[PDB]
Amino acid sequence: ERVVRDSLAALYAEEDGEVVKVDGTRIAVRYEDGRLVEHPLRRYARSNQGTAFDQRPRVRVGQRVKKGDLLADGPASEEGFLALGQNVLVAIMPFDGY
Amino acid sequence: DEVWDALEEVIHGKVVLLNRAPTLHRLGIQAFQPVLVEGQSIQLHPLVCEAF
Amino acid sequence: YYITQVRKEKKGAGMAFATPEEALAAYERGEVALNAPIVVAGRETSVGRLKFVFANPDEALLAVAHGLLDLQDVVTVRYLGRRLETSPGRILFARIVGEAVGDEKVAQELIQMDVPQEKNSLKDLVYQAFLRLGMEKTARLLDALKYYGFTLSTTSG
Amino acid sequence: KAPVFTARTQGRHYGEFVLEPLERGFGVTLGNPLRRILLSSIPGTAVTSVYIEDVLHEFSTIPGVKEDVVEIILNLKELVVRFLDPKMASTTLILRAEGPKEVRAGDFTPSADVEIMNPDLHIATLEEGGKLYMEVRVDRGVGYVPAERHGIKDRINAIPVDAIFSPVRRVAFQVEDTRLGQRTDLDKLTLRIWTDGSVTPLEALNQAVAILKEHLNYFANPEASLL
Amino acid sequence: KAPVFTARTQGRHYGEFVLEPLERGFGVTLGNPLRRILLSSIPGTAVTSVYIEDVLHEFSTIPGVKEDVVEIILNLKELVVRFLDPKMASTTLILRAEGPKEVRAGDFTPSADVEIMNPDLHIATLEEGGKLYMEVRVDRGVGYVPAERHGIKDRINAIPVDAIFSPVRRVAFQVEDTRLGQRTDLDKLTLRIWTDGSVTPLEALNQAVAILKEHLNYFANPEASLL
């Protein structure tokens, strides 16, 4: 969790507040101080190595979030946890030389 | 499929050289008869992996 | 190595019997294991060498296919004019080397059928096949050792 | 003897098929080839193309929609649609939706001779102001073919999707003991078939035996030779 | 498509059968089950009991003969006999000889309903001044049945014999990649069959595929319940 936190690839709530809009391009939340902030989601941007930098929303409309609560997952993150691959069912055995 | 057959006929009997670096002895280069294969990878016989 | 290695079990810890009928009876009570070394009359043997006495390899490998036997069990089998005490796996290996080389006589000449096959004996086998048979026959043998090598490694899990 | 058949089905998705008794070694001799064509060669349906009104390509977002088009196509790959008309090979389905709702599979504009088998399947969440105007080409096929293969151009802005045609989700079989028999060591085969509902397990098992018996007839008139 | 089905034989004991080309997975789908049937279901005949004069045990010896009783049973387990009518379920063959003789299997007293396809098969070597009279059970069955399960008791001094009923000696198959234009990953099934000559490998194969499709027809009359 902390790796994706300090990498600034995910998106988190600046303060306590409630989510009012959620779509693939933006997440708008109304915070305590009364401000309305919409957070643009970077979508299919190109990294130095050509990998897709893509953020995806992880909150629902009307969801009340605390400060530091996750709003959008960055690349290689699942609900705020580093997601560098897949969990696959493996069998440890030879197999016809392949 | 007409020209894949054509490529198969020019390949027949011919050999290509396969080289893995570093070439430490002469067996770092060996000649094989090519078999056309699906994918993007060269398929290397397992008994020659020691030499390479 | 897995098919040419031989089982040795603990249960029959050198138990002695006067007749093979007594040993086969003790095996049916579960007092002696199949390949546990035992003494019948004065000779050393095991239950499997008394229970399974095959006329030819095709009968021995047929029995293994029917689940009555594993390739690693030690058994009496008649192969190439003499009555051998060996495992079906060791017979299978000789069948593999023989049919790749073509002549099962000279195959039996350069195979060490009394030990598990390993890195060095296989390496020695390849060299002796190169000397006796030549390049292409040794290449066919290597492909055969490859095929049955992977196939049996997967089979045994 | 004469082996007894029984079939204990559950809805249109699960089916157990027992066979008793069999000679020692026929449980796997029958069950495994049955499992192999079942999992591989049962004809079925799947989405093969998708058009969304204001979407040019798969790497797009829809205003007022949480999921991107890649996710939507991911969800559409899970849509199972059975055909009632065997004369029908292909079709097209419409889906329009508005406002704050969770567009599920059953929200498609209904159509005769086709039936959604998993209407609770999620498609997309639309918030207030969100519009999703979509139509999906659905074809009949077999096996698995990725989008990268078939090229049709149904529409200029249509998006080909991966086609997972086979309606069979899982196959297992169990070889057990049976005392229903003359001797002691006979087999008891029990096929276990899971499907998506488009094709019942008994239909798939019947089609499997057909494909096997069809392929069995290939050992017929050989081209003889001898050394 | 429709594959070519070739056959390369050598006498009545060997057969090479290639089926090519075939859609992926089917070479294995056809291979193993046919292989399993060939080694376990094809019916044949086998020696099941022998009466030996002057001998009372399976581990003893016989004078006038260089071989012991164990070596005799081994040679009889290699004896292949053919029954001339299907109605015959068993028979008893007789052997009688004397003098310094090389006793082959063609030295059995000729029977009517039984042919010996091992005319020059070594059974025993008789020396100067030895006696050998012999009679042997021949039944028909399937597969491999040891003398341990069935202790047959129709004579007084008879010994049970391991019953190698199956006429198939050995089965080997493999699938390899064959190419058809664009694609290089299709199934080429090669089937290798050895028989004892009583039935040819080709006519052992058509029976295996006939036993298989017979077992597939059992999936027809279901007892539909549902839990």
Place this chain on the structure above:
Amino acid sequence: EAALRDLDEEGIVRIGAEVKPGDILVGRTSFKGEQEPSPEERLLRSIFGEKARDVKDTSLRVPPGEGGIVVGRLRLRRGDPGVELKPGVREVVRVFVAQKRKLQVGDKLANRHGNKGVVAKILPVEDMPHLPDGTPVDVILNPLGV
């Protein structure tokens, strides 16, 4: 006309088109550098009734082995507000292409423990080793690498 279908009005490829190696992404023409057409070139055109253009095709095509579908476009023209460009360059055009890459033979897999491997064989779910309940495994790893 077919090789130009996905080119818009001004010669650069449209967003959403699928581009395979060799396809045109940005159309461009360059003056030939006036030289005599060869006598063989003259007779060739006389046979097919084609009058020689004074310009050659130097358009940006997609390199071999690369491709995908166009997702972005960008044009920077000299003499337009906000942008200054290299001397001698009239304008630059940038096209962004995206592709979905699923696992294939040759791709490199690894775990956090240093186990490395290249995918060598993609196998049908039917051939895969499976549990008694019919569940198949996803990946087979050789114990000899341990």
Place this chain on the structure above:
Amino acid sequence: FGKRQGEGFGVDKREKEVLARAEKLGLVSPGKSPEEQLKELFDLGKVVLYDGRTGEPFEGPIVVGQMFIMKLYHMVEDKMHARSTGPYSLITQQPLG
């Protein structure tokens, strides 16, 4: 295993064939029931596994489970290259991309 009994299935004959050898080598304790021997394998991390090509089981128990596996980056120069004839450099006349 409990869910499997609730569905009405005992220990498969192929599993008992594997359990026999796991006892021969000494991987399960002799005397225990089939379910107990399967449990002695399962907490060793090992399970009975069937070959999807034959229906027969692999002769020994086989440790399966979930493993975290990543797909690693693929540089541009690592992709499949192939030249017959192309550009050649100016001063040295050697092949040039």
Place this chain on the structure above:
Amino acid sequence: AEPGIDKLFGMVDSKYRLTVVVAKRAQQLLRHRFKNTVLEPEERPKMRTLEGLYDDPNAVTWAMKELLTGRLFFGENLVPEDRLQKEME
């Protein structure tokens, strides 16, 4: 691939003289489009193909096949050089 390769190494004192013989003979086969072959039609190497079994287009394969028949002679200064190709066309 190359059957009888061990027998080919025996026909020559040096393995490299074999390569020269195979290569040079293969060059003559290409120059004359396999008309100058010494092989009978049933021992012509074939290529398994749909639409029939054509002749193997590999000249190195033919040269090795011909050399195994003994129907070729090889050696140094065996015949004048210019008179060779002048009289072979």
